[PDB]
Amino acid sequence: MKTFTAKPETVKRDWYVVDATGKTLGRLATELARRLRGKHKAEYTPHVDTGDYIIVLNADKVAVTGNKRTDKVYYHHTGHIGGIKQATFEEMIARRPERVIEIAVKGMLPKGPLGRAMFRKLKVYAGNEHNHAAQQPQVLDI
Amino acid sequence: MKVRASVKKLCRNCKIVKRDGVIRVICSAEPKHKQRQG
Amino acid sequence: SRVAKAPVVVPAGVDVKINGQVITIKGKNGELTRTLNDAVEVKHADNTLTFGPRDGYADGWAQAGTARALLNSMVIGVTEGFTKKLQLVGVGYRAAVKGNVINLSLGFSHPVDHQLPAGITAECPTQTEIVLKGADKQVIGQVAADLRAYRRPEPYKGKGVRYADEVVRTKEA
Amino acid sequence: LWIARINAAARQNGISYSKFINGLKKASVEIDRKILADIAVFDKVAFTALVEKAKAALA
Amino acid sequence: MIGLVGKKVGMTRIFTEDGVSIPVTVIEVEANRVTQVKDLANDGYRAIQVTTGAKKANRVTKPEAGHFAKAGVEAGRGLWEFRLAEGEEFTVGQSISVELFADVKKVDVTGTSKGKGFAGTVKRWNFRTQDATHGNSLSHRVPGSIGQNQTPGKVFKGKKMAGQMGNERVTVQSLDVVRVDAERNLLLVKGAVPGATGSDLIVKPAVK
RNA sequence: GUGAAGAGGGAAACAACCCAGACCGCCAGCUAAGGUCCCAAAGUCAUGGUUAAGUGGGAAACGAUGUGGGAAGGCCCAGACAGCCGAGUCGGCCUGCGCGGAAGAU
RNA sequence: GAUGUCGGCUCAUCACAUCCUGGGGCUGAAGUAGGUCCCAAGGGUAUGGCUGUUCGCCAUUUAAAGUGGUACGCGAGCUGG
RNA sequence: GCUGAAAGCAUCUAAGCACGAAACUUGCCCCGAGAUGAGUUCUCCCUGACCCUUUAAGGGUCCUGAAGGAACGUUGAAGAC
């Protein structure tokens, strides 16, 4: 016999909805990445995508411990000489609240085309409403 | 102000305080006794 | 602790309302509202308020003491009130009042106008004296400090704006 | 690969891989990981039976 | 507030009774016709679209003809947009004339600059020339050095070199208004503005 | 003792350090050093303590009512220590974990 | 069985132990001018006589004429004292 | 700096409230949906019949050829092409 392997033409996927109010950033991102990759199914296959679609609501109400609201710094570089830029957690929450969760989850996924395709099944909103009522998502408690 | 690694009481009217993670000396009699550790 | 173990009496003619941590006090001179820290429990028995720590916080007693002092000041201010006095020293310096605006002349080449906040009154007995009246201790102190900031007392003569009971040292050239 | 699949299958019945293997060892079952993964994918009633056996052994 | 679209005519001077000469640029401003109004509910921002001029019928396509006919105006030579501030309103079909600048003092003017083609460093960036004698070997107007060495071993982004110069968008700020003539459709400003004779200009009230 | 003349696993990448000496095949099992939140295989295991500095994840002489543990002293319901009545207060010794001294060139 | 090297010219880029401009504490700080320490890298920071000279002395200016790293930056970009 | 306990006094800080620089984020000018996360608004054009099989986002024959674009010519205060 030879071991079973999944086939991308026949794979089931479901839609879930999650709320982020008063939750810890890293301990939420771990579960999100695990379910995006598909490690909770017995049909797991390293070179195939066997994950689910997840919606996250209330992204501007996540929580951090310690003095991280004023001391966590995000860096980046522009490509021009001297172009190093930085932002703080509070400024990020004020300007672009979804990027926090997006970056946190992106850091925890495989690096390559398959990981880039995995990332496409995450939908993050900054409020309490979404326009995916035709897909009939189910409530997931993490 | 005096910026030093060693801050001490220099007379009888000096007081040692800790503000925002810094040790300081404040005097009610002599403005020359103000000190800051750094 | 030793300050949190002395109940606060509530004289006749004042009203207290407590909802969780929000406390309101009303009296002949006005009304004041506050929100306490989440480690103190305040109890109204018959004629006094008592303060104590909850269970599960490591700094209950300090918070209890702070709450005690704050509420004592509230009670005092809702019946009697608070007053402050300011003095001016120098040649040509003067002050006047119109509505809720104080006009100061203090040796500059432009006028100085200060706008009082809600709940504070000012009057000028002489041209070189200011008296402030109110019901909120912190606000009265902040207004006095702001007024003093314009021209602080100097060490060689003592000119400027000073408190009534302040000792201002001087030295020679 | 076999170990990862067995972990996924066991956490759906309510136990973890390490405890499941310990329970099988104490129950004297000698089935290997290849066959366990095969059964996990192609037959779930039998896998539930095995998990109950392991839980009873650990109890 | 809003602005207008005009055409550049030329340059001349004005003499004042006390003996001062003022250089002026002449702008021809005809009526601007409103073609579309954009609001928050439908589009997401508040603006107007305008046209001016004329165009021969045999050079207008069907889509453009329909767009004009919906508003009920004739065909011009272009379409431009202006943003609206709170408290302003217009209606489709309206006409706006040069008397809008009756009480304005300073303006900003936007246009397209003249073209110079491929240019060198002496002219494009004001580099200094090396010596004409004293042994120079074929290096008179060349740029010189463009980097350091093994560290970093490359050229930095944004280095100044040779290439296309001119023929781009340019704005000039805070020019005085010398005259507004409504009978002849003229606006006289003081100074020089970008472009050549016969080009399109955008005029707005000063922002500073 | 190892490399030279030696492959495999660990220390991110790393001849000479730690574990261990490759005759050939297997889609079987047990362990060594090192590990069990995600990248990435395996405890978001159980009981009792310490730290608030992201210390953990660079560096001294010296300075300071940070905060745990211990063995002894002085004064005090004869009214002590603080300020202008009523329960404690003062300064040394040993010890665990933290804080300042702490400035560089894509 | 080859990694061209001192000064000069043309062109630059970074650090902060800050020369000018900005904000402060102490003074044996009356005012005007000064002394010392803390924060701060946005912009700007000379022409000539002598010498192959980097330096340096001298004459006359300027708010000021900063100290260092980049194969003691830069010869498949120039010169050859 | 204001109010304030731990520590009955005192204390800018532990809980709360207010000022403060050419450095940071904006305000001024220019590019910008290959932003593969490829977005929005207004207007214009296309309204025929048959066959085959391995029956499906299948192959072929006849009739029809819109909106618009490109090519050629006279050229430009646009341009190495």
Task: Delimit the domains of chain E by residue range.
Answer: 1-208
Residue type, E143: P
Q: Which nucleotide is nearest to A105 (CA to C1')?
A: F38
Both structure tokens of E195: 């472009």
Statement to judge: residues C54 and C91 lie in one domain = no
Statement to judge: residues C68 and C90 lie in one domain = no
Q: Which of A62, A58, A64, A45 has the alpha carbon at shortest distance from A114?
A: A45
Statement to judge: residues C87 and C46 lie in one domain = no
8 Å CB contact between E27 and E197: no
Beta bridge partners of A54: A16, A122
8 Å CB contact between A74 and A34: no
Please, is A99 exposed, middle or buried when counting C-beta atoms within 10 Å of its C-beta (0-12, 13-18, 19+)? middle
Question: Does the residue C170 lie in any domain?
Answer: no
Question: Does the residue C115 lie in any domain?
Answer: yes
Cα–Cα distance, E52 to E34 (Å, whole number): 9
Helix (H) or strand (E) holding A94: helix A89-95
Cα–Cα distance list, A132 to A57, A128, C37 (Å):
12, 13, 43
Q: Which of A40, A43, A46 sits opposite D41 (nearest CB)?
A: A43
Q: DSSP 3-state assignment of C72?
A: helix
Q: The domain spanning residue C70 has which CATH number?
A: 3.90.930.12
The count of structural domains within chain A is 1
Parallel, antiparallel, or unpaired: how do β-strands E115-119 and E163-166 relate? antiparallel
Q: How many CA atoms lie within 13 A of E91 on its CB side?
A: 1
Q: Which of D8, D34, D38 sits opposite A41 (nearest CB)?
A: D8
Which residues, at least 6 apart from D38, have a Cβ–Cβ distance to it below 8 Å? A1, A3, A4
Residue type, C66: T
Question: Does the residue C60 lie in any domain?
Answer: yes
Query: How far in angstroms lies nucleotide H4's C1' from the CA of residue A70?
Result: 26
Statement to judge: residues C119 and C50 lie in one domain = no
F62 nearest neighbour residue (CA to C1'): B6
Strand F contact nucleotides, protein CB < 7 Å: 27-29, 36-44, 52-54, 61-66, 99-101, 106
Statement to judge: residues C90 and C134 lie in one domain = yes
The count of structural domains within chain C is 2
Last residue of one domain, picked from the residues C57, C76, C95: C76
CB contact under 8 A, E158 and A79: no
A→D contacts (Cβ < 8 Å), by residue, are 1, 3-4, 39-44, 46
Cα–Cα distance, C39 to C64 (Å, whole number): 8
Residue A89, domain extent: 1-142
First-to-last C-alpha distance (Å) of chain B:
11
Cα–Cα distance, C104 to C124 (Å, whole number): 12
Q: Which of A98, A101, A96, A91 has the alpha carbon at shortest distance from A130?
A: A98
For residue A41, which residues of chain D lie inside 8 Å, CB to CB? 8
Neighbours of C125 (CB within 10 A): 9
Statement to judge: residues C104 and C59 lie in one domain = no
Last residue of one domain, picked from the residues C76, C99, C134: C76
Q: What angle do CA E141, E142, E143 make, to 5 degrees?
A: 120
Question: Does the residue C171 lie in any domain?
Answer: no
Number of residues written out for chain B = 38
Last residue of one domain, picked from the residues C60, C76, C92: C76
Statement to judge: residues C89 and C64 lie in one domain = no
Neighbours of C107 (CB within 10 A): 11
Alpha helices in chain D (DSSP H): 2-13, 17-27, 33-42, 44-58
DSSP 8-state class, residue A79: S
Resolution of the structure in the document, Å: 2.3
Cα–Cα distance, E63 to E73 (Å, whole number): 15
Residue C72, domain extent: 8-76
Residue type, C165: D
Both structure tokens of C10: 């509530």
8 Å CB contact between D2 and D36: yes
Neighbours of A71 (CB within 10 A): 10
Question: Does the residue C155 lie in any domain?
Answer: yes
Query: How far in angstroms lies nucleotide G15's C1' from the CA of residue B5?
Result: 26
For residue A46, which residues of chain D lie inside 8 Å, CB to CB? 1
Phi/psi at C141 (5° precision): -65, -40
The gap from C-alpha C131 to its chain's centroid, in whole angstroms, comes to: 13
Question: Does the residue C52 lie in any domain?
Answer: yes
Question: Does the residue C140 lie in any domain?
Answer: yes
Q: What is the DSSP string of C94-161?
A: EEEEETTEEEEESS-SS-EEEE--TTEEEE-SSTTEEEEEES-HHHHHHHHHHHHHTSPPPSSS--EE
Cα–Cα distance, A127 to A132 (Å, whole number): 14
